[PDB]
Design an enzyme around this catalytic site. Structure first.
Site, mmCIF file in Angstrom:
data_model
loop_
_atom_site.group_PDB
_atom_site.id
_atom_site.type_symbol
_atom_site.label_atom_id
_atom_site.label_comp_id
_atom_site.label_asym_id
_atom_site.label_seq_id
_atom_site.Cartn_x
_atom_site.Cartn_y
_atom_site.Cartn_z
ATOM 1 C CB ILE A 178 -1.074 -0.012 1.114
ATOM 2 C CG1 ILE A 178 -2.111 -1.133 0.899
ATOM 3 N N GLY B 190 7.474 2.832 4.303
ATOM 4 C CA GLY B 190 7.837 3.404 5.591
ATOM 5 C C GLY B 190 9.318 3.726 5.628
ATOM 6 C CB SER B 191 11.303 5.386 8.348
ATOM 7 C CG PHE B 192 13.423 1.866 9.493
ATOM 8 C CD1 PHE B 192 14.583 2.634 9.496
ATOM 9 C CD2 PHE B 192 12.440 2.146 10.434
ATOM 10 C CE1 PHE B 192 14.754 3.660 10.426
ATOM 11 C CE2 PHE B 192 12.616 3.168 11.365
ATOM 12 C CZ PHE B 192 13.766 3.923 11.350
ATOM 13 C CD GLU C 203 8.883 -0.758 0.033
ATOM 14 O OE1 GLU C 203 8.000 -0.372 -0.766
ATOM 15 O OE2 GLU C 203 9.855 -0.047 0.377
ATOM 16 C CB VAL C 204 3.305 0.083 4.616
ATOM 17 C CG1 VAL C 204 2.112 -0.191 5.532
ATOM 18 C CG2 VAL C 204 4.355 0.913 5.358
ATOM 19 C CE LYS D 53 7.828 1.354 8.713
ATOM 20 N NZ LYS D 53 9.156 1.286 8.044
ATOM 21 C CG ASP E 114 9.908 12.650 8.071
ATOM 22 O OD1 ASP E 114 10.197 13.691 7.436
ATOM 23 O OD2 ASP E 114 9.844 11.521 7.537
HETATM 24 C C1 LIG Z 1 1.772 3.154 -3.944
HETATM 25 C C2 LIG Z 1 0.847 3.893 -2.974
HETATM 26 N N1 LIG Z 1 -0.462 4.081 -3.614
HETATM 27 C C3 LIG Z 1 -0.541 5.385 -4.291
HETATM 28 C C4 LIG Z 1 -0.132 5.217 -5.756
HETATM 29 C C5 LIG Z 1 -1.578 3.813 -2.686
HETATM 30 C C6 LIG Z 1 -1.927 5.020 -1.797
HETATM 31 N N2 LIG Z 1 -1.830 4.649 -0.367
HETATM 32 C C7 LIG Z 1 -2.654 3.775 0.223
HETATM 33 O O1 LIG Z 1 -3.558 3.186 -0.371
HETATM 34 C C8 LIG Z 1 -2.403 3.472 1.715
HETATM 35 C C9 LIG Z 1 -3.256 2.742 2.529
HETATM 36 C C10 LIG Z 1 -4.640 2.211 2.139
HETATM 37 N N3 LIG Z 1 -2.711 2.602 3.738
HETATM 38 C C11 LIG Z 1 -1.506 3.186 3.764
HETATM 39 C C12 LIG Z 1 -0.523 3.284 4.756
HETATM 40 C C13 LIG Z 1 -0.624 2.857 6.089
HETATM 41 C C14 LIG Z 1 -1.721 2.344 6.784
HETATM 42 O O2 LIG Z 1 -2.798 1.974 6.320
HETATM 43 N N4 LIG Z 1 -1.403 2.216 8.075
HETATM 44 C C15 LIG Z 1 -0.138 2.608 8.254
HETATM 45 C C16 LIG Z 1 0.654 2.655 9.400
HETATM 46 C C17 LIG Z 1 1.964 3.129 9.333
HETATM 47 C C18 LIG Z 1 2.491 3.578 8.123
HETATM 48 CL CL1 LIG Z 1 4.118 4.188 8.082
HETATM 49 C C19 LIG Z 1 1.695 3.545 6.965
HETATM 50 C C20 LIG Z 1 0.389 3.038 7.029
HETATM 51 C C21 LIG Z 1 -1.279 3.729 2.491
HETATM 52 C C22 LIG Z 1 -0.017 4.499 2.057
#
Ligand SMILES: CCN(CC)CCNC(=O)c1c(C)[nH]c(/C=C2\C(=O)Nc3ccc(Cl)cc32)c1C
EC number: 2.7.11.1
Length: 289
Positions: free
Chosen positions: A24, A27-29, A31-32, A47, A137
């Site tokens: 999705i 993250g800093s270290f 992939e989520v 993560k 950040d």
């Molecule tokens: C490649 C990314 N893409 C845009 C082209 C999808 C957009 N982002 C998402 O759909 C997204 C979703 C549904 N959830 C997240 C991120 C989450 C999230 O859902 N919970 C969460 C906790 C800690 C951190 Cl660092 C990040 C996350 C994200 C970035």
């Protein structure tokens, strides 16, 4: 030797308890990923950190600690961590609306949306600052939304902890465009560094990009402590330009607290409920589809 490190995590194989799905974001270290807790069936964000690659281990440890010490509806919730050899699985709250940066992709934000987003970021900052934590950040990419419009702060990878032992921090950390001048110079700094970064984020919400985006990140690092602070330029309201100016003061003593900023005219002018932000989520879903 990493003594005591493994003791803090569940040694159970995370592939048995969790079903890993599509990526999705990052993250800093690591992939989520999207995930489902096999027992509850509930949606989670996973993560995956390669400890051999990010060997940065003190900062990974810092993020684990920080997330487990936070208990707020404005901070991404943490559900534990699972170790599988050199891989560390950090299970967190699922936020289906994506980031504030993702939400700028289909086009510009009306002022009503910006003020609602900044108000909810400030509630998150007020909680962290009261817990003596500094995010370090703050940027649109680290502001996440639920599918119901709830706004939460994410990514504690470079977060700082102040104590009676350590009143101030001096670490050089953050993303160049959003970094406070005292952080860049490595002077003693506190919560006021997030206030400056919030002012940069306010411009980023209005323009789609932080100020001086036309410049190289290394040039920007050299100029931030030397040049006048950025300003909100163009067709934007006077209270919005004032909010930005309040945040972007070079002397941290004059930057207001999150609590004070929640009382700013720009924030109080609009009284939208967070559910109002679901229109931006719908706009992004229509744009991606
Ligand atoms: C490649 C990314 N893409 C845009 C082209 C999808 C957009 N982002 C998402 O759909 C997204 C979703 C549904 N959830 C997240 C991120 C989450 C999230 O859902 N919970 C969460 C906790 C800690 C951190 Cl660092 C990040 C996350 C994200 C970035």
């Amino acid at each position: 030797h990493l003594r005591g490190f493994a003791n803090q995590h569940s040694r159970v194989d995370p592939e048995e308890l969790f079903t890993k799905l599509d990526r999705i974001g990052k993250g800093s270290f690591g992939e989520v990923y999207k995930g489902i807790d096999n027992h509850t069936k509930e949606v989670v964000a996973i993560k995956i950190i390669d400890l051999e690659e990010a060997e940065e281990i003190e900062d990974i440890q810092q993020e684990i600690t920080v997330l487990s010490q936070c208990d707020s509806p404005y901070i991404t919730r943490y559900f534990g961590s699972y170790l599988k050899s050199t891989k560390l699985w950090i299970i967190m709250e699922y936020l289906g609306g994506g980031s504030a940066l993702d939400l700028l992709k289909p086009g510009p934000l009306e002022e009503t949306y910006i003020a609602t987003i900044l108000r909810e970021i400030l509630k998150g900052l007020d909680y962290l600052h009261s817990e003596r934590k500094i995010h370090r950040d703050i940027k649109a990419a680290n502001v996440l939304l639920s599918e119901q419009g709830d706004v939460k702060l994410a990514d504690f990878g470079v977060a700082g902890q102040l104590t009676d032992t350590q009143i101030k921090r001096n670490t050089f950390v953050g993303t160049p465009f959003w970094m406070a001048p005292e952080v860049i110079k490595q002077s003693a700094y506190d919560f006021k560094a997030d206030i400056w970064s919030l002012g940069i984020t306010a411009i980023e919400l209005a323009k789609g990009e932080p100020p001086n985006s036309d410049l190289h990140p290394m040039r920007v690092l050299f100029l931030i402590p030397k040049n006048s602070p950025p300003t909100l330029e163009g067709q934007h309201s006077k209270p919005f330009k004032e909010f930005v100016e309040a945040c972007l003061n070079k002397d941290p003593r004059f930057r207001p607290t999150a609590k004070e900023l929640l009382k700013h005219k720009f924030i109080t002018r609009y009284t939208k409920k967070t559910s109002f932000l679901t229109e931006l989520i719908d706009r992004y879903k229509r744009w991606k589809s």
